[PDB]
Amino acid sequence: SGAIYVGNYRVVNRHLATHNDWANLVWEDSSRDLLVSSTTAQGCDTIARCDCQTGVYYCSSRRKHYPVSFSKPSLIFVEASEYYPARYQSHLMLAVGHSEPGDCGGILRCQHGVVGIVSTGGNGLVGFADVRDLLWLDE
Numbered sequence: 001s002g003a004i005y006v007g008n009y010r011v012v013n014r015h016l017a018t019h020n021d022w023a024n025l026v027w028e029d030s031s032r033d034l035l036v037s038s039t040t041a042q043g044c045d046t047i048a049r050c051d052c053q054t055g056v057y058y059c060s061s062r063r064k065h066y067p068v069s070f071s072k073p074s075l076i077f078v079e080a081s082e083y084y085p086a087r088y089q090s091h092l093m094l095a096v097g098h099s100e101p102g103d104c105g106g107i108l109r110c111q112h113g114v115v116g117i118v119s120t121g122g123n124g125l126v127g128f129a130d131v132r133d134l135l136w137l138d139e
């Protein structure tokens with residue numbers, strides 16, 4: 001679990017979105033596993049606008065933050081689930097690090113601010129859904 005709160009927006013993994021998220025829907029993209037909903041309070045997370053390939057993520061299954069090197073956003077195939085058939089997930093970055101189902105939603109940050117949220121993993125790998133291209137989150 002976990003979300004990004006920026007301005008009047010809440011960004012979450014689409015497979016974990018609530019009834020409230022869907023009732024207050026701004027935008028969603030199944031291929032990115034992202035959903036954005038509107039909020040009543042002002043969010044203060046800063047979104048990074050960069051091409052960093054290093055950062056720190058929060059890993060709930062370890063109650064710890066870990067430093068990581070991560071790949072550039074790309075199409076990476078993925079397997080099924082209560083959520084989505086076999087498929088390519090776009091705007092996805094991979095890193096060598098611990099993740100288990102339950103870690104989805106943990107924030108990845110670089111010196112510039114929020115980069116994305118944990119989405120996918122397994123085998124000593126962890127994936128992050130990038131949010132740095134969603135320029136509209138700021139305005």
Ligand SMILES: CSc1ccccc1CC(=O)N1CCC[C@](F)(C(N)=O)C1
Pocket residue numbers: 015033078081083084089099100101102103104118119120121122123127
């Ligand atoms: C951190 S998730 C993880 C980690 C280790 C092992 C397994 C998982 C689970 C996982 O990869 N998925 C199930 C939930 C939806 C999913 F995140 C997606 N974006 O399609 C795929």
Ligand SMILES: [Zn+2]
Pocket residue numbers: 048049050051052110111112113
């Ligand atoms: Zn950065």
